[PDB]
Amino acid sequence: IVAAAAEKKSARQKKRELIAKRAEAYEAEYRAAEREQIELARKARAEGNYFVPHEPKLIFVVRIRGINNIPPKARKIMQLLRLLQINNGIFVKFNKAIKEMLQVVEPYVTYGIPNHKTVRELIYKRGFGKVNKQRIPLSDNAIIEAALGKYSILSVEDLIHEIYTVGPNFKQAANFLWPFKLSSPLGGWRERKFKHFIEGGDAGKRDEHINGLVQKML
Amino acid sequence: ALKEYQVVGRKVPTEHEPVPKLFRMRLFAPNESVAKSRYWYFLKMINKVKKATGEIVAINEISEPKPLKAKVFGIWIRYDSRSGTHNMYKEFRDTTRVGAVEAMYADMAARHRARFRSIRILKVVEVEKKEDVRRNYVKQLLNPHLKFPLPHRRTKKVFAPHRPSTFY
């Protein structure tokens, strides 16, 4: 009994610094990624040339209209996206095929590129894993290691990396994650909620301004 | 509020056009997203460059070089009206180009019932020469001995015990 307990504790410990080393590596990678973008922009400005950042592979989509008076095409699309309520949020692998799909539900959803804090804030607080078709909160790393252990995801930091950086197993990581059930935004929306964001409304693409909405949502 | 942006862009290079030309516009928008869309439709209507085959290469907010010097700005704009076409040129005295544009938008919405999408700004230029100023009210402000009493003095604490002063 003592040998088994010691063996359990040891292997569990060896898993712990493994998580610690991975999380440290991801944090260093993020800082090195932001440093290089700043250096690339600075040197381009110094040379008079211009630099185009990478277009982010990750998008966060929030549904902003109720389940009423929606055309069946938009209804089916949001069913595919798993946006079955207002304020529901999802991480989607933004690519060529997703863009035209979102062009149809543009009046009904708003989307933009989330930053590290937003994706970290959402998973820690609104993060509920989908285990055995049940909505289970991510209260420990045991759930993550037992549900995504076949894709080398062992902790919350590993899941955050696979989501934020759009890893090879992004589909599995996102599908494991129940849609975020965000609250109504503190402070409220704009005067009109159902115009285009570019026209003073709230629907449609908003790029780096989705973070400001998410802070109110949380 | 508003901020002035410069948007530089081009179409995606191909074999037919290995080095596409670089198109830069100075335009005003509340945020970068509106500026990029404002630029894209302008590029569509001037040079027929599609948004899909193009890309925004550089976005840069611009701050006023001398926000502490009062200046006079003349604004050439085009309006969409009942006839769908009109040309106007106004003058505003303000210390910032952004504020001058904001004043222009407020005045046009107040007078001609003009909205942001209905107004397209052609050119906002500074008029340093006093003689080049055309507007009489601007010239009135530019007179050296300008003086006038406070207009619209207008003045919870309900039930004041004494009568208002509203004078000196």
Binding site: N49 | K21, M25
Partner: peptide, 21 residues
């Protein structure tokens, strides 16, 4: 098609030209 990657856009050959509507 993946999103467009970061690249360079040399302008010394074609300096930006001012466009007005």
């Amino acid at each position: 098609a993946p999103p467009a990657k970061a690249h360079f856009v040399s302008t010394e050959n074609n300096e930006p030209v001012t466009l007005h509507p």
